[PDB]
């Protein structure tokens, strides 16, 4: 059955982007998915997206751009302390300029640079380069 809706959203975005599509429809929506896509958006990777609202879990239309190589989820959401974060990026991002671990910390959902800037750790969600 359907577990980890963020995994489905990111797999759908990845499979759409590898076919060179302009838009992708991802369902069901979630607040975690919206925060993840907002972090992905604010660095310039997925353009701009629109939430479609039914009286169910909603849908999202994401207007893909072409910059995205890979967006991925890490299941299960391992606890990431502020030291071990370096190990994690040495595991996940293949290059040290671009790529992003997305963390859920108590200060919100943000990227690993901002998580170091806030001097906090948390649980891991994904990465995108």
């Amino acid at each position: 059955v359907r577990m980890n809706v963020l995994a489905d959203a990111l797999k759908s975005i990845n499979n759409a982007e590898k076919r060179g599509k302009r838009q992708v429809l991802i369902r069901p929506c979630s607040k975690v998915i919206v925060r993840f896509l907002t972090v992905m958006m604010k660095h310039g990777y997925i353009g701009e997206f629109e939430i479609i609202d039914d009286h169910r879990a909603g849908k999202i239309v994401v207007n893909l751009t072409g910059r995205l190589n890979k967006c991925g989820v890490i299941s299960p959401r391992f606890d990431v302390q502020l030291k071990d974060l370096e190990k994690w990026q040495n595991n996940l991002l293949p290059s040290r300029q671009f790529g992003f671990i997305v963390l859920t910390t108590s200060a919100g959902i943000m990227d690993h640079e901002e998580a170091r800037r806030k001097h906090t750790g948390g649980k891991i969600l994904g990465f995108f380069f």
Partner: peptide
């Protein structure tokens, strides 16, 4: 056709070239 060792070497090196191209493209925008 050809052994897999240089196949993964070609894929890794082309991915390295792809990374360097993306890095220099993002560096040019500054």
């Amino acid at each position: 056709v050809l052994p897999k060792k240089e196949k993964m070497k070609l894929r890794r090196e082309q991915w390295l070239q792809k990374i360097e191209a993306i890095k220099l493209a993002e560096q040019k925008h500054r």
